[PDB]
Amino acid sequence: QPFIPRPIDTCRLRNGICFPGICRRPYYWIGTCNNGIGSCCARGWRS
Numbered sequence: 001q002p003f004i005p006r007p008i009d010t011c012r013l014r015n016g017i018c019f020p021g022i023c024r025r026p027y028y029w030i031g032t033c034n035n036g037i038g039s040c041c042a043r044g045w046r047s
Contacts, residue, residue, distance in 0.1 A: 007030070007047070008047045019033065020038045028041055
């Protein structure tokens with residue numbers, strides 16, 4: 001976190017990574033991907 005992580009948003013803040021599975025590091029889960037099985041998790045950290 002170079003910037004100060006504001007309140008966590010959903011995948012509305014999009015395009016960081018879509019994982020098949022889950023985000024563990026460095027990636028914060030923002031909503032789901034692969035229509036449910038994957039994870040919209042943008043590269044970096046929020047909260």
